[PDB]
């Protein structure tokens, strides 16, 4: 048979497993605490839903696996420094960055970057927006452990989701409009036909990247939409949240796409006929009333509900835009008030 | 939580389970062999993927549990006899029939029914199995074991076959999918095609018939009605008190799949009318191995049952759906060569419907 093991017990793994079953592919998602003896790792291909991991007996063994795809790619991506660096080596648009070592760097820093400064964690994610006077508002921890970027005034956020096969073939989904709030992805909108020039450009970028990396499987690229054009923000070496829509909006979902690649399967270009809307469910309980709207696709992760925690998502796709928008509106009252903003935002796209 | 136990380990149970997962509904498909203790039956809604079952300590337990939905409806449907009587009682159009009680009845039988005599087993006949097409000279060709255990219907000459899949909620509400065109070969379903917009009159008449049925039985869940298309109109062939192979296209071709729809019904979840925007085609994979090459075609949706491949056995299906019929048909072509010869007929047939 076809057998895969996924490093990580998360919802992504879950979704990957779900995607594989019908395909005859057996996915065994697995947590770091996992004993080597419980995983059939010795007989499968390995993938991961996580960028980095502790050194356990298992992870240790996976260190010498002739089948841990992209195993060595991770480390570069895992680190925001080397990542940013990667962009630089490729001559790909990105926000002016520096490593934040000394406090003895601040003056210049606020000099290079200007007014506002955005700081993030090199690893494990993680973002502080400081000004010339907030400078001591930050931990000393972040010294040579955090990066520093120019505050970017973008007009929109987009994400590019695609895959590269073992033969270098690549496929892409259309660009996805993303809405973050309090640094969390709240809402996504995907149009069957994105802006040609935008799409092309992004594809160029993502491809340069994946090939330079030698990357195999699905990877996502977060970008900013600027008057000066697109700028790469972040890279995710795995299926990404902003593509969850593909489960019901494309002929091949991302999870599927991933599996295909790593399992040496056909990687044709997925069909996308209609727009989709994804609603992230953050720290809310399941309201089966949502299921009254026929266009709604509930994806419940089955995790303990808790504040700020991603517990599921709602997938909405249809041919009728009216029907599509009416569903959204009807949703408002079925969701806690904090959801209203995103819903509306998405709604605004169909105007 | 939301927990469901399914009497039966088959592909249907599997698909129900898959369908439930993202909904937060745990489904436990149970093998007949299974020890009762081992099933979370006491704290779940019970359902079944089979019409009938042997007397096992397992079935004994389950069948007796007040949680078993439609438990009583089963016996009536499982027996072609009682099922036929039900159509009658409902005054629903169906092939003229009779119970084959005694040999000395043959003469009479041929009197009413005509030339061709289609004999069917009352119980246990899944894929045109225990069924005989006999003539006045062939009667001796039929097992004696059938006397009283089988019925006879008049050979029906139909333009085509269609199945209606729908559901009834605890609250009497009902939903339906568009009529599905079916192609049986060697008494086996090979292919189905659905159109977003079936024949209104035909669609409505079938629906009227399905409801009367479900209502009359107070059925709660997905049920499928097989009909023959004839000159006079539609005739009820068979009923399926459960998710049916002919509905497999709903998995990828409807906003709510028949699996999803069945779990919703039984757990008392909302049951709005599924949204169907395009046509779809389902291809049944019989006794054939998996060909991942099939996946070369972006519109193909593989459904592998993970069973042991055997001749005449249902190992999976291929769903194909799309707004662009040409793409659709061009896909179908592209598959012919990907499938073993026996498949070509179905395909072309399928193809034949878009033209
Ligand atoms: N340099 C920047 N200028 C403006 N906004 C930014 C900048 N960097 C990040 N953001 C904002 O922070 C969000 C999340 O930041 P990021 O660190 O890239 O992702 P994550 O928190 O998901 O790991 C962005 O998607 C955007 O709202
Ligand atoms: N009275 C009849 N006249 C003509 N064809 C019939 C008749 N009864 C059954 N058939 C044929 O046999 C097929 C399968 O038989 P059926 O008993 O209805 O289902 P199954 O054996 O699959 O449970 C039908 O789909 C049809 O092609
Ligand atoms: Mg982000
Ligand atoms: Mg039948």
Binding-site residues, ligand 2, Cβ < 6 A: B 95, 118, 120, 125-129, 131, 153, 155-156, 161, 184, 187, 237-238
What is the C-alpha separation between B285 and B287, in angstroms, rounded?
7
In whole angstroms, how large is the CA radius of gyration of chain A?
Answer: 21
Tokens describing residue A254: 């991302």
- Note the ligand closest to the C-alpha atom of A96: 1
- Between the CA atoms of B56, B86, B192 and B310, what dihedral angle is there, to the nearest 10 degrees? 30
A94-151 and A71-93+152-350 share a CATH fold: no
Report whether A281 contacts A311 (CB < 8 A).
Answer: yes
Q: How far apart are CA B224 and CA A292, in angstroms?
A: 23
CA distance to A207, B320, B344, per residue, from B181 (Å): 44, 14, 17
Q: How far is the CA of A169 from the CAs of A63, A206, B172, in angstroms?
A: 27, 13, 52
| Alpha helices per DSSP H over B104-196 | 106-113
Run of H or E residues at A147: strand A146-150
Residue A114, ligand 1, Cβ within 6 A: no
CB atoms near residue A315 (< 10 Å): 21
Q: Does residue A315 have its Cβ closer than 6 Å to ligand 1?
A: no
**Gaps in chain B (C to N distance exceeding 2.5 A) after:** none
**Atom 24 of ligand 2, nearest CA residue:** B187
- Using alpha carbons, select from A84, A15, A78 the residue that is nearest to residue A255: A15
What is the three-class DSSP state of B147? Answer: coil
Give the separation between CA A67 and CA A46, rounded to whole angstroms.
6
Orientation angle between helical segments A196-213 and A80-90, nearest 10 degrees: 110
Q: Do A282 and A182 contact (CB within 8 A), yes or no?
A: no
Alpha-carbon distances of A306 from A49, A310, B24, B75, rounded to whole Å: 21, 8, 17, 46
The bridge status of strand A127-131 relative to strand A116-121 is: antiparallel
Q: What are A26's strand-pairing partners?
A: A3
Tell me the three state secondary structure of residue B221. strand
- Residue in A16, A18, A22 to test binding to B, most B beta-carbons within 10 Å: A22
Do A221 and A206 meet the contact criterion of CB atoms below 8 Å apart?
yes
Q: How far apart are CA B195 and CA B197, in angstroms?
A: 5
What are all long-range contacts of A125-130, with beta carbons under 8 Å and residues at least 24 apart?
A: A127/A183
Those residues with Cβ within 8 angstroms of residue A160's Cβ, 6 or more apart along the chain or in another chain = A172, A173, A175, A176, A202, A203, A205, A206, A220, A221, A223
In the three-class reduction of DSSP (H, G, I as helix; E, B as strand; rest coil), residue B293 is classed as helix
Q: How many CB atoms lie within 10 A of CB A249?
A: 29
Q: What is the DSSP string of A156-205?
A: EEEEEEEEE-TTS-EEEPPPEEEEEETTEEEEEEE-SS--HHHHHHHHHH
Identify the H or E element spanning A349. helix A340-349
H and E: helices and strands count for chain B: 10, 16
| Residue carrying the six token digits 């089963």 | B74
Chain A: give the shortest CA distance to residue B342, in Å.
23
Determine the CATH number of domain B71-93+156-354: 3.30.470.20
- Extents of the domains making up chain B: 1-70, 71-93+156-354, 94-155
Q: Cβ of A271 and B21 within 8 Å?
A: no
Count of other CB atoms within 10 angstroms of residue B339: 17
| CATH number corresponding to A1-70 | 3.40.50.20
Decide yes or no: CATH 3.30.1490.20 for domain A94-151.
Answer: yes
Q: Quote the DSSP letter at residue A144.
A: T
CATH superfamily name and code, A71-93+152-350: ATP-grasp fold, B domain (3.30.470.20)
Instruction: Compute CA distances B53 → B49, B233, B263, whole Å.
Output: 10, 35, 21
Technique of determination: X-ray
Coil/strand/helix, residue A89: helix
If you write DSSP's letter for every residue of A264-325 in order, what string do you get?
T---PPPP--S-EEEEEEES----GGGGGSTTEEEEE------TT-EEEEEEEE-S-HHHHH
Query: How close is the Cα of A157 to the center of ligand 1, in Å?
Result: 9
Q: Is B65 helix (H, G, I), strand (E, B) or coil?
A: coil
Can you identify the CATH homologous superfamily of domain B94-155? Answer: ATP-grasp fold, A domain (3.30.1490.20)
């Amino acid at each position: 048979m076809k057998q895969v093991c996924v490093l990580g017990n998360g919802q992504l793994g879950r979704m990957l497993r779900q995607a594989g079953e019908p395909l005859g592919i057996a996915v065994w998602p697995v947590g770091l605490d996992a004993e080597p003896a419980a995983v059939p790792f010795q007989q499968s291909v390995i993938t991961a839903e996580i960028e980095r991991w502790p050194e356990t007996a298992l992870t240790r063994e996976l260190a010498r696996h002739p089948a841990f795809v992209n195993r060595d790619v991770f480390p570069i991506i895992a680190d925001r420094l080397t990542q940013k660096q990667l962009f630089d080596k490729l001559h790909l648009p990105t926000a002016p960055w520096q490593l934040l070592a000394e406090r003895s760097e601040w003056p210049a820093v606020f000099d290079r970057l200007g007014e506002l400064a955005i700081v993030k964690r090199r690893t494990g994610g993680g973002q502080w927006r400081l000004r010339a006077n907030e400078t001591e508002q930050l931990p000393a921890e972040c010294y040579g452990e955090c990066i520093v970027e120019q505050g970017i005034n973008f007009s929109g956020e987009v994400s590019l989701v695609g895959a590269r096969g073992f033969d270098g073939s690549t496929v892409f989904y259309p660009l996805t409009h993303n809405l973050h709030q309090d640094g969390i992805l709240r809402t996504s909108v995907a149009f069957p036909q994105a802006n040609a020039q935008q799409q092309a450009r992004a594809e160029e970028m993502l491809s340069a990247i994946m090939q330079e990396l030698g990357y195999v499987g699905v990877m996502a690229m977060e970008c900013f939409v600027t008057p000066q054009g697109l700028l790469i923000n972040e890279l995710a070496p795995r299926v990404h949240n902003s593509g969850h829509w593909t489960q019901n909006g494309a002929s091949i979902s991302q999870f599927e796409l991933h599996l295909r690649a790593i399992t040496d399967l056909p990687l044709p270009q997925p069909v996308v006929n209609n727009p989709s809307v994804m609603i992230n469910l953050i720290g809310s309980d399941v309201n089966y009333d949502w299921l009254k709207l026929p266009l709604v696709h509930l994806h419940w992760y089955d995790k303990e509900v808790r504040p700020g925690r991603k517990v599921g998502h709602l997938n909405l796709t249809d041919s009728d835009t009216s029907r599509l928008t009416a569903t959204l509106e009807a949703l408002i009252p079925l969701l806690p008030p904090e959801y209203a903003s995103g819903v509306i935002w998405a709604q605004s796209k169909f105007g």
